[PDB]
Amino acid sequence: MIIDRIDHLVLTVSDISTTIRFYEEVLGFSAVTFKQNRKALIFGAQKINLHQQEMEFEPKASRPTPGSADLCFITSTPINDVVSEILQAGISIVEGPVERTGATGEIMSIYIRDPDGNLIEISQYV
Known part of the structure; x- marks a missing residue:
């Protein structure tokens, strides 16, 4: 078995709409709906599926928990320009x-x- 990359991951959130707005408006991700009622955020060649509490599709993690994620994204935008955008937001x-x-x-x-x-x-590479 040879692993090439992470394709996507699942975030458990309290409210999908609030989450979608944050990621689209702040990080510029693009929200989409697949399989009729499932939400996901697209970026680059990867994506993040969203599971709302009380609606977590299975299989899922053993302990689905909002606020437990710690992710690092790579940006092509100059990091200083990113700080300003974050602050302006x-x-x-x-x-x-x-x-x-x-x-x-x-x-x-x-x-x-x-x-x-x-x-x-x-983040951005040195």
Whole structure:
């Protein structure tokens, strides 16, 4: 078995609409509906499926929990330009631009939180 990449992942949220607005307006993701009533956010060649509490389709994680996610995204946009966009959006920065370790090398990152409390790390390689 040879694994190439992560295709997508599932986020459990309290309210899909609130989550969709955050990700479309702040990170520029694109919301879509598949299988008649399922929601997902598209970005690059990957996606994130959304499961609302009380509507978590199966199979699912053993302990579905809103606000338990900690994701790092790579941006092609200059990181400083990202900070400003985040600030202009009215979003609070958890931790300003700071050097971190990426999968390949060193990255400069910014941290913010989504509506449920999940930690979102937007980064760029050094």
